[PDB]
Amino acid sequence: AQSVPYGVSQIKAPALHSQGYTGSNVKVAVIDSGIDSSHPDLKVAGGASMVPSETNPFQDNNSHGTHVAGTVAALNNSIGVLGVAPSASLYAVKVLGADGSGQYSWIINGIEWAIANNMDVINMSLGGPSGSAALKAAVDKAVASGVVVVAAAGNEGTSGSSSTVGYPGKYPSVIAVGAVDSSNQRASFSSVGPELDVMAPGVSIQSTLPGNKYGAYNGTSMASPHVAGAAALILSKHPNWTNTQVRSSLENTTTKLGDSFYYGKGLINVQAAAQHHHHHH
Amino acid sequence: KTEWPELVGKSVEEAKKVILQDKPAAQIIVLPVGTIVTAEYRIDRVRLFVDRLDNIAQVPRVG
Ligand SMILES: [Ca+2]
Ligand code: NA
């Protein structure tokens, strides 16, 4: 039997599924360590690797990209977990090697591949403390081209009054996602700052792991794909909505939690986001 | 102890020794400063970001 991880229910994705919307025909690039395409609870539609020494994007030697991919799009069937957008067209854009790191140029090359291949949504469960002009230009280009770009806020916790949101999350063109648990409490590690946009579940998140496994991971990396998957559900119900509109729908319909420095606009609610009229609950 | 600001500017070797005294089961991974990394949180891990001289270039922290 299939299990629905709590975070998929928490963001109200089953309300979209019951309406008949599951992300069909929406192209989501998981820009990450690869995706294990042999996993029976994933269907990978395509991809490319920007990692010079790891040329196969369908081999995930780390595990992280496979876990992120399952939160976006684990298949709706009788096994494993259920993804937020289980019919999405999932693309493995490998820019991180086995050790979980990549060079800025590899990340930018993956964003450029996503733009050239007409991705609707990019998920970046990754970050670093410094930006670069070239990284900012790649994300701004993807957004100018119509792509919804979602990233983890980072796991740098608090530092007095300073922002600790990393890049590319910290760029205004990117939706930076922090992590809450099942009680809607901010995870102690979740980055903070005025660039924090929305929150999603990022504690003890069950998803797919390589070699036909499943397991619970923690991080803003886990929160980000709930929002990327929610964007794919919204686009499957409203295929002409722009990325501007998808982003605003998610921002404008959160459940407000605490102070925005710690919680941004609150927890996403994809049921409310996918209505025509938007307000907070 | 979950952060080691006193290690910035030290060699990677000293940093490893010190972190393993405080957290002997730590999974230490050495990465180049200025890379982008996965944003998962691993309580057992300490990433050490080094400059091109193999000195610590960012405050080591658990995660
Ligand atoms: Ca399934
Ligand atoms: Na941002």
Short mmCIF file of C-alpha atoms and ligand atoms in Angstrom, two decimals:
data_model
loop_
_atom_site.label_atom_id
_atom_site.label_comp_id
_atom_site.label_asym_id
_atom_site.label_seq_id
_atom_site.Cartn_x
_atom_site.Cartn_y
_atom_site.Cartn_z
CA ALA A 1 0.00 0.00 0.00
CA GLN A 2 1.03 3.61 -0.59
CA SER A 3 1.51 6.04 2.29
CA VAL A 4 0.96 9.78 2.10
CA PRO A 5 3.77 11.54 4.02
CA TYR A 6 2.38 14.03 6.52
CA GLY A 7 3.87 17.03 4.75
CA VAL A 8 1.92 16.30 1.53
CA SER A 9 -1.31 16.38 3.59
CA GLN A 10 -0.14 19.38 5.62
CA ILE A 11 0.13 21.64 2.54
CA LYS A 12 -3.35 20.42 1.39
CA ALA A 13 -2.13 18.71 -1.77
CA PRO A 14 -4.82 15.94 -1.45
CA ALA A 15 -7.47 18.65 -2.07
CA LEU A 16 -5.96 19.25 -5.50
CA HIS A 17 -5.64 15.52 -6.17
CA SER A 18 -9.37 15.07 -5.34
CA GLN A 19 -10.20 17.87 -7.82
CA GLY A 20 -8.34 15.76 -10.44
CA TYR A 21 -5.11 17.79 -10.54
CA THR A 22 -1.73 16.14 -10.01
CA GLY A 23 0.77 18.18 -12.05
CA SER A 24 0.19 16.48 -15.41
CA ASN A 25 2.19 17.96 -18.28
CA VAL A 26 4.14 20.28 -16.00
CA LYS A 27 7.91 20.06 -16.42
CA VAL A 28 9.83 20.26 -13.10
CA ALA A 29 13.64 20.28 -13.06
CA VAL A 30 15.17 18.97 -9.84
CA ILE A 31 18.56 20.74 -9.95
CA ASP A 32 20.43 18.58 -7.53
CA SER A 33 22.62 15.42 -7.19
CA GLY A 34 20.77 13.44 -9.81
CA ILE A 35 17.68 11.20 -9.57
CA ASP A 36 17.71 7.42 -9.35
CA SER A 37 15.53 6.67 -12.38
CA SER A 38 15.36 2.94 -11.51
CA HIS A 39 13.24 3.69 -8.42
CA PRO A 40 9.76 2.11 -8.99
CA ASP A 41 8.06 5.02 -7.24
CA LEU A 42 9.59 7.65 -9.64
CA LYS A 43 9.22 8.31 -13.32
CA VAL A 44 12.04 10.45 -14.69
CA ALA A 45 11.14 12.08 -18.02
CA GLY A 46 14.62 13.39 -18.96
CA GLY A 47 17.56 15.41 -17.76
CA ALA A 48 21.23 16.18 -18.14
CA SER A 49 24.37 16.25 -16.03
CA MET A 50 26.61 19.33 -15.60
CA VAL A 51 29.04 17.45 -13.27
CA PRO A 52 32.27 16.81 -15.26
CA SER A 53 33.17 13.56 -13.45
CA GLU A 54 29.58 12.17 -13.09
CA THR A 55 28.00 12.24 -16.56
CA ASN A 56 24.84 10.24 -15.85
CA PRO A 57 22.05 12.39 -14.34
CA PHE A 58 20.00 9.20 -13.64
CA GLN A 59 22.53 7.86 -11.18
CA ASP A 60 22.32 9.56 -7.83
CA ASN A 61 25.49 8.78 -5.90
CA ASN A 62 24.49 11.00 -2.98
CA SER A 63 20.74 10.20 -2.32
CA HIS A 64 19.63 13.81 -1.83
CA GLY A 65 18.24 14.51 -5.33
CA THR A 66 16.24 11.26 -5.29
CA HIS A 67 14.69 12.22 -1.93
CA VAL A 68 13.84 15.75 -3.17
CA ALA A 69 12.39 14.31 -6.38
CA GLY A 70 10.05 12.00 -4.44
CA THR A 71 8.60 14.90 -2.48
CA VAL A 72 7.93 16.71 -5.80
CA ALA A 73 6.58 13.76 -7.74
CA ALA A 74 6.65 10.28 -6.24
CA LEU A 75 4.10 8.29 -8.28
CA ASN A 76 0.46 7.70 -7.35
CA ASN A 77 0.22 3.93 -7.15
CA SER A 78 0.05 1.20 -4.51
CA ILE A 79 3.65 1.54 -3.28
CA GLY A 80 5.96 3.77 -1.34
CA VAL A 81 5.04 7.38 -0.87
CA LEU A 82 2.83 9.82 -2.81
CA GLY A 83 4.37 12.99 -4.22
CA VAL A 84 2.91 16.48 -4.11
CA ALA A 85 2.52 16.47 -7.94
CA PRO A 86 2.62 12.76 -8.79
CA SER A 87 1.98 13.27 -12.52
CA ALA A 88 4.63 15.93 -13.07
CA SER A 89 7.20 15.44 -15.82
CA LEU A 90 10.32 15.11 -13.67
CA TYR A 91 13.76 16.10 -14.98
CA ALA A 92 17.05 15.13 -13.33
CA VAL A 93 19.42 18.12 -13.71
CA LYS A 94 22.55 16.92 -11.99
CA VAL A 95 24.78 19.78 -10.80
CA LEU A 96 26.06 18.27 -7.51
CA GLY A 97 28.43 15.37 -7.21
CA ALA A 98 28.42 12.46 -4.77
CA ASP A 99 29.73 14.65 -1.94
CA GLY A 100 26.77 17.00 -2.20
CA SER A 101 28.72 19.98 -3.64
CA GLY A 102 28.97 21.70 -6.98
CA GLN A 103 30.75 24.57 -8.56
CA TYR A 104 28.74 27.76 -9.30
CA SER A 105 29.26 27.21 -13.03
CA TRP A 106 27.68 23.70 -12.83
CA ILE A 107 24.59 25.14 -11.08
CA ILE A 108 24.33 27.93 -13.69
CA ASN A 109 24.74 25.46 -16.53
CA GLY A 110 21.86 23.42 -15.07
CA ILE A 111 19.62 26.52 -14.78
CA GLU A 112 20.48 27.34 -18.43
CA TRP A 113 19.62 23.76 -19.49
CA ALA A 114 16.30 24.10 -17.70
CA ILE A 115 15.50 27.35 -19.54
CA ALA A 116 16.54 25.90 -22.92
CA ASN A 117 14.39 22.81 -22.30
CA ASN A 118 11.26 24.75 -21.36
CA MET A 119 10.98 23.71 -17.73
CA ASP A 120 7.94 25.19 -15.96
CA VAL A 121 9.40 24.86 -12.46
CA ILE A 122 12.93 24.63 -11.04
CA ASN A 123 13.59 23.25 -7.56
CA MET A 124 16.99 24.06 -6.02
CA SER A 125 17.39 22.28 -2.67
CA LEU A 126 20.86 23.77 -2.35
CA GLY A 127 22.71 26.92 -1.41
CA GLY A 128 25.83 28.79 -0.39
CA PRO A 129 26.50 31.84 1.76
CA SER A 130 27.79 34.02 -1.10
CA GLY A 131 26.15 35.03 -4.33
CA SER A 132 27.70 35.73 -7.69
CA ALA A 133 26.57 38.06 -10.45
CA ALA A 134 26.46 35.10 -12.86
CA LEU A 135 24.26 33.07 -10.49
CA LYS A 136 21.88 36.00 -10.00
CA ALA A 137 21.75 36.49 -13.78
CA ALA A 138 20.86 32.79 -14.38
CA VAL A 139 17.98 32.78 -11.89
CA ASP A 140 16.73 36.19 -13.09
CA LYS A 141 16.87 34.88 -16.67
CA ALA A 142 14.86 31.77 -15.74
CA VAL A 143 12.20 33.92 -14.06
CA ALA A 144 12.12 36.42 -16.97
CA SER A 145 11.59 33.43 -19.24
CA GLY A 146 8.50 32.28 -17.28
CA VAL A 147 10.00 29.59 -14.96
CA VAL A 148 8.84 29.31 -11.31
CA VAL A 149 12.12 29.10 -9.36
CA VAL A 150 12.01 27.67 -5.83
CA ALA A 151 14.96 27.14 -3.48
CA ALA A 152 15.74 26.08 0.07
CA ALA A 153 16.28 29.05 2.39
CA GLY A 154 19.23 27.27 4.02
CA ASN A 155 19.87 25.63 7.36
CA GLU A 156 21.90 28.37 9.06
CA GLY A 157 19.51 28.91 11.96
CA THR A 158 19.53 32.33 13.65
CA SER A 159 22.28 34.92 14.07
CA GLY A 160 20.77 37.73 16.10
CA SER A 161 19.20 40.26 13.76
CA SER A 162 21.15 39.17 10.65
CA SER A 163 19.65 37.38 7.68
CA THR A 164 20.97 33.86 7.29
CA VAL A 165 19.19 32.97 4.05
CA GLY A 166 21.65 31.58 1.49
CA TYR A 167 21.88 31.95 -2.27
CA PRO A 168 20.15 31.48 -4.63
CA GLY A 169 17.23 31.62 -2.16
CA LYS A 170 18.27 35.14 -1.09
CA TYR A 171 17.75 36.61 -4.62
CA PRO A 172 14.37 38.39 -4.94
CA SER A 173 13.56 36.42 -8.13
CA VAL A 174 13.70 33.07 -6.24
CA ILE A 175 11.12 31.81 -3.78
CA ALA A 176 13.08 31.00 -0.58
CA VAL A 177 11.47 28.26 1.48
CA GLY A 178 12.00 27.64 5.21
CA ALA A 179 11.13 24.50 7.20
CA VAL A 180 8.46 23.76 9.75
CA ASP A 181 7.51 20.55 11.53
CA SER A 182 4.09 18.86 11.75
CA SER A 183 3.00 21.34 14.44
CA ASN A 184 3.91 24.30 12.24
CA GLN A 185 6.89 25.20 14.42
CA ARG A 186 9.97 26.49 12.67
CA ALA A 187 12.76 23.93 12.68
CA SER A 188 15.69 25.18 14.80
CA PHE A 189 18.03 24.96 11.78
CA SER A 190 15.75 26.85 9.34
CA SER A 191 17.41 30.06 7.99
CA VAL A 192 15.84 33.39 8.81
CA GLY A 193 15.68 36.88 7.40
CA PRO A 194 13.52 39.26 5.34
CA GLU A 195 14.26 37.09 2.24
CA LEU A 196 12.43 34.10 3.78
CA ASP A 197 9.29 33.84 1.66
CA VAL A 198 7.16 30.86 2.73
CA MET A 199 7.47 27.70 4.87
CA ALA A 200 6.78 24.06 4.16
CA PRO A 201 7.31 20.76 6.01
CA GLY A 202 11.02 19.99 6.43
CA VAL A 203 11.28 17.72 9.52
CA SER A 204 11.19 13.92 9.27
CA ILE A 205 10.05 13.93 5.65
CA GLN A 206 9.66 10.44 4.17
CA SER A 207 10.58 10.14 0.50
CA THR A 208 12.34 7.91 -2.09
CA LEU A 209 16.00 7.01 -1.75
CA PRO A 210 18.27 5.22 -4.25
CA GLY A 211 18.13 1.46 -4.68
CA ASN A 212 14.40 1.23 -4.08
CA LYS A 213 14.47 2.56 -0.53
CA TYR A 214 12.59 5.22 1.47
CA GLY A 215 13.59 7.29 4.43
CA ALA A 216 13.02 10.38 6.54
CA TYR A 217 15.29 13.41 5.88
CA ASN A 218 15.33 16.88 7.46
CA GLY A 219 16.18 20.22 5.98
CA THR A 220 15.05 23.24 4.04
CA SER A 221 16.00 20.94 1.14
CA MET A 222 12.89 18.92 2.05
CA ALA A 223 10.65 21.97 2.40
CA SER A 224 11.56 23.47 -1.05
CA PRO A 225 10.14 20.52 -3.15
CA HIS A 226 6.77 20.80 -1.39
CA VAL A 227 6.57 24.30 -2.85
CA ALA A 228 7.94 23.26 -6.25
CA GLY A 229 5.39 20.43 -6.29
CA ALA A 230 2.62 22.85 -5.21
CA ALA A 231 3.59 25.11 -8.14
CA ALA A 232 3.19 22.13 -10.49
CA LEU A 233 -0.26 21.33 -9.05
CA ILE A 234 -1.32 24.98 -9.48
CA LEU A 235 -0.07 25.03 -13.11
CA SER A 236 -1.89 21.78 -13.87
CA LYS A 237 -5.17 23.37 -12.71
CA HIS A 238 -4.35 26.79 -14.30
CA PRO A 239 -2.03 26.04 -17.25
CA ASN A 240 -2.01 29.62 -18.48
CA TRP A 241 -1.08 31.19 -15.15
CA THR A 242 2.32 32.83 -15.33
CA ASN A 243 5.11 32.16 -12.89
CA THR A 244 4.28 35.61 -11.44
CA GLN A 245 0.74 34.42 -10.76
CA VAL A 246 1.80 31.02 -9.35
CA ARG A 247 4.23 32.73 -6.99
CA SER A 248 1.66 35.25 -5.83
CA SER A 249 -0.98 32.55 -5.40
CA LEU A 250 1.30 30.67 -3.01
CA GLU A 251 2.38 33.80 -1.13
CA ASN A 252 -1.10 35.22 -0.82
CA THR A 253 -2.75 32.07 0.58
CA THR A 254 -0.35 30.87 3.26
CA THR A 255 -1.47 30.12 6.76
CA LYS A 256 0.31 32.90 8.65
CA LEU A 257 2.47 31.60 11.50
CA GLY A 258 4.85 33.80 13.50
CA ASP A 259 6.90 36.86 12.77
CA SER A 260 7.92 37.04 9.10
CA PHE A 261 11.61 37.19 9.95
CA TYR A 262 11.29 33.57 11.22
CA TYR A 263 8.30 32.28 9.25
CA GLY A 264 8.05 34.47 6.12
CA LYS A 265 4.41 34.52 5.07
CA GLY A 266 3.67 31.20 6.78
CA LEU A 267 2.84 27.69 5.64
CA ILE A 268 1.77 27.15 2.02
CA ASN A 269 -1.74 25.96 1.34
CA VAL A 270 -2.00 24.71 -2.24
CA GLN A 271 -5.81 24.22 -2.00
CA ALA A 272 -6.27 27.95 -1.33
CA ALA A 273 -3.53 28.92 -3.82
CA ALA A 274 -5.27 27.06 -6.66
CA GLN A 275 -8.61 28.92 -6.20
CA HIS A 276 -9.20 32.05 -8.24
CA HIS A 277 -9.62 34.26 -5.21
CA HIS A 278 -6.82 34.30 -2.73
CA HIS A 279 -6.63 35.01 0.97
CA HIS A 280 -4.79 33.71 4.01
CA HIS A 281 -6.27 31.09 6.29
CA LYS B 1 29.04 22.51 21.09
CA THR B 2 27.65 22.86 17.53
CA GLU B 3 29.77 25.66 15.94
CA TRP B 4 33.55 26.26 15.99
CA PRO B 5 34.28 29.89 15.07
CA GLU B 6 37.72 29.62 16.70
CA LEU B 7 38.74 27.23 13.88
CA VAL B 8 38.43 29.77 11.04
CA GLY B 9 41.89 30.38 9.59
CA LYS B 10 43.33 27.13 11.09
CA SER B 11 44.53 24.20 9.00
CA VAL B 12 41.97 21.58 7.98
CA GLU B 13 44.02 19.04 10.00
CA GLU B 14 43.72 20.95 13.25
CA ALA B 15 40.03 21.56 12.62
CA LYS B 16 39.39 17.83 12.13
CA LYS B 17 41.31 16.99 15.32
CA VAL B 18 39.40 19.55 17.39
CA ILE B 19 35.97 18.70 16.05
CA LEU B 20 36.56 14.95 16.66
CA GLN B 21 37.52 15.72 20.28
CA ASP B 22 34.21 17.51 20.79
CA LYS B 23 32.09 15.21 18.59
CA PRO B 24 33.94 11.93 18.14
CA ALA B 25 31.26 10.33 15.94
CA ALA B 26 31.23 13.35 13.53
CA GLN B 27 31.05 12.60 9.80
CA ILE B 28 33.46 15.20 8.52
CA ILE B 29 33.47 16.19 4.87
CA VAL B 30 35.97 18.63 3.44
CA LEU B 31 34.65 20.81 0.60
CA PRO B 32 36.01 23.82 -1.28
CA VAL B 33 34.83 27.22 0.03
CA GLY B 34 32.62 28.92 -2.55
CA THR B 35 30.74 25.80 -3.68
CA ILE B 36 27.02 25.30 -3.52
CA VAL B 37 25.88 22.35 -1.39
CA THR B 38 22.75 20.30 -0.56
CA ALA B 39 20.48 21.92 2.00
CA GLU B 40 19.61 18.85 4.09
CA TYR B 41 20.31 18.88 7.83
CA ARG B 42 22.44 16.05 9.20
CA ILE B 43 23.03 16.18 12.94
CA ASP B 44 26.04 13.83 12.64
CA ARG B 45 27.81 15.86 9.92
CA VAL B 46 30.32 18.71 10.01
CA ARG B 47 31.26 20.14 6.65
CA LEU B 48 34.65 21.91 6.59
CA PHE B 49 34.96 24.54 3.87
CA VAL B 50 38.54 25.21 2.94
CA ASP B 51 40.35 27.78 0.87
CA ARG B 52 42.89 26.82 -1.82
CA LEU B 53 45.62 26.61 0.90
CA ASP B 54 43.56 23.99 2.88
CA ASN B 55 42.80 26.40 5.71
CA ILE B 56 39.28 26.72 7.14
CA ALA B 57 37.48 29.61 5.42
CA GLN B 58 34.00 29.47 7.02
CA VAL B 59 32.82 28.75 10.59
CA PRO B 60 32.35 24.96 10.90
CA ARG B 61 28.92 23.99 12.21
CA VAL B 62 26.95 20.80 12.69
CA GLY B 63 24.45 20.07 9.95
CA CA C 1 3.62 5.79 -4.68
NA NA C 2 14.25 35.09 -2.69
#
